mmCIF file of all heavy atoms in Angstrom:
data_model
loop_
_atom_site.group_PDB
_atom_site.id
_atom_site.type_symbol
_atom_site.label_atom_id
_atom_site.label_comp_id
_atom_site.label_asym_id
_atom_site.label_seq_id
_atom_site.Cartn_x
_atom_site.Cartn_y
_atom_site.Cartn_z
ATOM 1 N N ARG B 74 413.533 96.986 42.432
ATOM 2 C CA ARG B 74 413.208 98.060 41.500
ATOM 3 C C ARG B 74 414.608 98.715 41.009
ATOM 4 O O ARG B 74 414.907 98.989 39.851
ATOM 5 C CB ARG B 74 412.261 99.124 41.979
ATOM 6 C CG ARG B 74 412.062 100.196 40.938
ATOM 7 C CD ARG B 74 410.912 101.084 41.450
ATOM 8 N NE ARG B 74 411.323 101.855 42.693
ATOM 9 C CZ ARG B 74 410.551 102.516 43.427
ATOM 10 N NH1 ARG B 74 409.121 102.619 43.259
ATOM 11 N NH2 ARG B 74 411.084 103.169 44.497
ATOM 12 N N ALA B 75 415.442 99.129 42.033
ATOM 13 C CA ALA B 75 416.600 99.806 41.776
ATOM 14 C C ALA B 75 417.554 99.024 40.939
ATOM 15 O O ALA B 75 418.436 99.558 40.204
ATOM 16 C CB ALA B 75 417.431 100.060 43.053
ATOM 17 N N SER B 76 417.379 97.749 40.772
ATOM 18 C CA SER B 76 418.128 96.792 39.906
ATOM 19 C C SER B 76 417.818 97.156 38.481
ATOM 20 O O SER B 76 418.705 97.181 37.599
ATOM 21 C CB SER B 76 417.852 95.406 40.231
ATOM 22 O OG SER B 76 417.302 95.193 41.524
ATOM 23 N N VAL B 77 416.558 97.163 38.192
ATOM 24 C CA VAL B 77 415.881 97.378 36.936
ATOM 25 C C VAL B 77 416.085 98.694 36.286
ATOM 26 O O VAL B 77 416.065 98.989 35.215
ATOM 27 C CB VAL B 77 414.540 96.824 36.998
ATOM 28 C CG1 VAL B 77 413.954 96.921 35.491
ATOM 29 C CG2 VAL B 77 414.369 95.444 37.484
ATOM 30 N N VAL B 78 416.058 99.796 37.135
ATOM 31 C CA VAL B 78 415.917 101.115 36.532
ATOM 32 C C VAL B 78 417.209 102.033 36.780
ATOM 33 O O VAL B 78 417.188 103.159 36.469
ATOM 34 C CB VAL B 78 414.762 101.931 37.003
ATOM 35 C CG1 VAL B 78 413.447 101.175 36.597
ATOM 36 C CG2 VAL B 78 414.793 102.243 38.497
ATOM 37 N N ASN B 79 418.263 101.460 37.164
ATOM 38 C CA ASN B 79 419.498 102.266 37.442
ATOM 39 C C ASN B 79 420.136 102.786 36.110
ATOM 40 O O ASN B 79 419.841 102.183 34.950
ATOM 41 C CB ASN B 79 420.576 101.396 38.218
ATOM 42 C CG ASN B 79 421.046 100.324 37.258
ATOM 43 O OD1 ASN B 79 421.987 100.488 36.524
ATOM 44 N ND2 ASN B 79 420.539 99.134 37.466
ATOM 45 N N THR B 80 420.966 103.928 36.161
ATOM 46 C CA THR B 80 421.569 104.316 34.925
ATOM 47 C C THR B 80 422.139 103.236 33.965
ATOM 48 O O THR B 80 421.844 103.172 32.794
ATOM 49 C CB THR B 80 422.668 105.440 35.227
ATOM 50 O OG1 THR B 80 422.088 106.423 36.043
ATOM 51 C CG2 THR B 80 423.197 105.895 33.924
ATOM 52 N N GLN B 81 422.968 102.411 34.576
ATOM 53 C CA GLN B 81 423.629 101.225 33.868
ATOM 54 C C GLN B 81 422.588 100.352 33.104
ATOM 55 O O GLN B 81 422.769 100.023 31.956
ATOM 56 C CB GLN B 81 424.421 100.346 34.780
ATOM 57 C CG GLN B 81 425.897 100.824 34.912
ATOM 58 C CD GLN B 81 426.612 100.846 33.532
ATOM 59 O OE1 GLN B 81 426.600 99.896 32.725
ATOM 60 N NE2 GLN B 81 427.180 101.965 33.332
ATOM 61 N N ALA B 82 421.559 99.972 33.821
ATOM 62 C CA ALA B 82 420.528 99.074 33.267
ATOM 63 C C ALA B 82 419.780 99.731 32.009
ATOM 64 O O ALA B 82 419.511 99.020 31.073
ATOM 65 C CB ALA B 82 419.602 98.539 34.320
ATOM 66 N N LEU B 83 419.503 101.089 32.298
ATOM 67 C CA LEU B 83 418.802 101.748 31.236
ATOM 68 C C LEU B 83 419.652 101.888 29.872
ATOM 69 O O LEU B 83 419.244 101.556 28.814
ATOM 70 C CB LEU B 83 418.444 103.170 31.758
ATOM 71 C CG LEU B 83 417.058 103.441 32.053
ATOM 72 C CD1 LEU B 83 416.387 102.286 32.778
ATOM 73 C CD2 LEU B 83 417.004 104.620 32.960
ATOM 74 N N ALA B 84 420.926 102.293 30.111
ATOM 75 C CA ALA B 84 421.836 102.365 28.994
ATOM 76 C C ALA B 84 421.977 101.169 28.190
ATOM 77 O O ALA B 84 421.840 101.189 26.945
ATOM 78 C CB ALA B 84 423.215 102.927 29.547
ATOM 79 N N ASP B 85 422.173 99.978 28.840
ATOM 80 C CA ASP B 85 422.251 98.708 28.209
ATOM 81 C C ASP B 85 421.006 98.444 27.346
ATOM 82 O O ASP B 85 421.081 97.858 26.256
ATOM 83 C CB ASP B 85 422.503 97.690 29.197
ATOM 84 C CG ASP B 85 423.859 97.803 29.846
ATOM 85 O OD1 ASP B 85 424.512 98.887 29.785
ATOM 86 O OD2 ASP B 85 424.166 96.852 30.658
ATOM 87 N N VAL B 86 419.775 98.900 27.839
ATOM 88 C CA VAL B 86 418.610 98.656 27.049
ATOM 89 C C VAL B 86 418.704 99.542 25.738
ATOM 90 O O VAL B 86 418.282 99.158 24.729
ATOM 91 C CB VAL B 86 417.350 98.953 27.790
ATOM 92 C CG1 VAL B 86 416.077 98.844 27.001
ATOM 93 C CG2 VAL B 86 417.295 98.066 29.084
ATOM 94 N N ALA B 87 419.276 100.692 25.869
ATOM 95 C CA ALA B 87 419.424 101.631 24.706
ATOM 96 C C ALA B 87 420.389 101.040 23.727
ATOM 97 O O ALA B 87 420.199 101.125 22.512
ATOM 98 C CB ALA B 87 419.835 102.964 25.242
ATOM 99 N N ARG B 88 421.538 100.557 24.259
ATOM 100 C CA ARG B 88 422.634 100.065 23.392
ATOM 101 C C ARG B 88 422.135 98.894 22.469
ATOM 102 O O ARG B 88 422.641 98.676 21.477
ATOM 103 C CB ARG B 88 423.768 99.611 24.256
ATOM 104 C CG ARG B 88 424.513 100.724 24.859
ATOM 105 C CD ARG B 88 425.825 100.213 25.651
ATOM 106 N NE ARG B 88 425.933 100.800 27.033
ATOM 107 C CZ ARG B 88 426.513 102.002 27.236
ATOM 108 N NH1 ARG B 88 426.831 102.707 26.124
ATOM 109 N NH2 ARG B 88 426.632 102.410 28.470
#
Side-chain angles (χ1 to χ4, degrees):
Chain B
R74 180 175 64 193
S76 339
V77 184
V78 305
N79 68 84
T80 303
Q81 267 308 302
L83 257 39
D85 295 6
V86 175
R88 293 185 222 279

